[PDB]
């Protein structure tokens, strides 16, 4: 069966370059053109270009000439894209997609995409601050100043799951991510039971637990 394997994520320093890999299996690599698709956070699909693995012929989106260079290695059935002179707006999920043959059957198989983050920050654990509550009431934890993505937030070791909202992580002007996780609980339970948010940051091997008190 057709597989287009891409690495999950990569953190690259601005100004440098990165060579994204797309390793195929389940078909003859030289039988299908390979496409690459950019998706900046929250935005749409942007087409970068295409390459014919038989002779490495390439056609680029005009806005990526000199920014992205497609190549191919037939011996390992793997397509590559090299993005150079990385800046913050190159932060995107980059997909490889196999073009069908005949071409008018569209891109039938897509890779999982490589989440590329362009930032100069170093691996840093998060600071967790309580969102103190004040019928139904809301309380939460402010997960601030960590890099890179992602963090996992649990409530009471996984016992409290209903009513929980872990918002997407925003990016601040300092280059670090900031995230809020909230949960609504009955007001009667306030002052009685305890509420603890369990923040785990895998890249920095940091685990933080914070009790949320009114």
């Amino acid at each position: 069966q057709v597989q287009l394997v891409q690495p999950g994520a990569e953190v690259v320093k601005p100004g440098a370059s990165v060579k994204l890999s797309c390793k195929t299996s389940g078909y003859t690599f030289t039988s299908n053109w390979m496409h690459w698709v950019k998706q900046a956070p929250g935005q749409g699909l942007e087409w970068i270009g295409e390459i014919d693995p038989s002779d490495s012929y390439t056609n680029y989106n005009q806005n990526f000439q000199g920014k992205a260079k497609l190549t191919v290695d037939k011996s390992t059935s793997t397509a590559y894209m090299e993005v150079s002179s990385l800046r913050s707006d190159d932060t995107a999920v980059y997909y490889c997609a196999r073009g069908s043959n005949p071409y008018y059957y569209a891109m039938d198989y897509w890779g999982q995409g490589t989440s590329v983050t362009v930032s100069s920050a170093s691996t840093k654990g998060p600071s967790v601050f309580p969102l103190a509550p004040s019928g139904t009431a809301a309380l939460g934890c402010l997960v601030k100043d960590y890099f890179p993505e992602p963090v996992t937030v649990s409530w009471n070791s996984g016992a409290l799951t209903s009513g929980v909202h872990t918002f997407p992580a925003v990016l601040q002007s300092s280059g670090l991510y900031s995230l809020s996780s909230v949960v609504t609980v009955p007001s009667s339970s306030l002052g009685t039971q305890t509420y603890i948010c369990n923040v785990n940051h895998k890249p920095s091997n940091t685990k933080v637990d914070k009790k949320v008190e009114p």
Partner: protein
Amino acid sequence: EIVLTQSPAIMSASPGERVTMTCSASSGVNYMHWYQQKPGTSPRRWIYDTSKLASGVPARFSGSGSGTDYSLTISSMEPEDAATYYCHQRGSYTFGGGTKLEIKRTVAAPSVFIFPPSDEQLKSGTASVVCLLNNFYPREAKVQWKVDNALQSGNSQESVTEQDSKDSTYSLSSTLTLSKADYEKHKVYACEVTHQGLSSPVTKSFNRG
């Protein structure tokens, strides 16, 4: 050379309702493909060669078009169809802008909560004020930050969850970022929330101490 413009940008469809989205090209083309992308997942081929349904695509999905006007049709909207659909073709240099198809439900006004900066965060030089908007529909809403009735601008970041699986609502959190010096300068902090389910704006506020 060939620009693809999709319409409309956002679509609210009730269960069972008919759904039709359009994709227009700046010049004539022979065919058009449609791709489905749900949040967090990679795009998938959904309708290729104008009207051929890809593997696994339900029969309620329909493709049609000619020349410069192409369309995607759902005869009976289901909650599993909520996603973003992109149209594309080799002749075009890039994808269309996409059409976000969301599940339509009854109006639910947001529940507003405000949180003052914690004491240990104030021990550093930053004070984050958070306003929560919980489980509301539709998506459209306005959050204003008022500190000593002064309208704030350019010092707040917003975050919105995807549509919830169970109740099909949205949640929004707005974070006001101010230094410790600027925080203790003022007294009253408030967020003003406006939404079509609220005839009057809901204001949550607190005072320092």
